[PDB]
């Protein structure tokens, strides 16, 4: 739960760092979509 189940190793360090980077990119991309959606919400409610 608090730790992804895998045997520790160097290769594992590479894969987990990659998975963290993927999660970060996903978070940024979602933030951009949320920005567009709230822009649409505001412009709809504008007038």
């Amino acid at each position: 739960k608090d730790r992804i189940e895998i045997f520790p190793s160097r290769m594992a360090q590479t894969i987990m760092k990659a998975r963290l980077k993927g999660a970060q990119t996903g978070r940024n991309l979602l933030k951009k979509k949320s920005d567009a959606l709230t822009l649409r919400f505001r412009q709809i409610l504008k007038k």
Partner: protein, 49 residues
């Protein structure tokens, strides 16, 4: 037309915000702790040798 778009876009925003929040407050800390544990274990193993 405007009102229809508004009512659907509301739940659209809600689901997107839920997804980003769940991503930013669940998985990232978990992975970071796992990496901390991994670095510690690698250090242990080298020092024994």
């Amino acid at each position: 037309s405007l009102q229809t778009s508004f009512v659907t876009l509301d739940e659209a925003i809600k689901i997107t915000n839920r997804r980003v929040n769940a991503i930013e407050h669940v998985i990232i800390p978990r992975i970071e702790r796992t990496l901390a544990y991994i670095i510690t274990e690698l250090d242990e193993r080298e020092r024994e040798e």
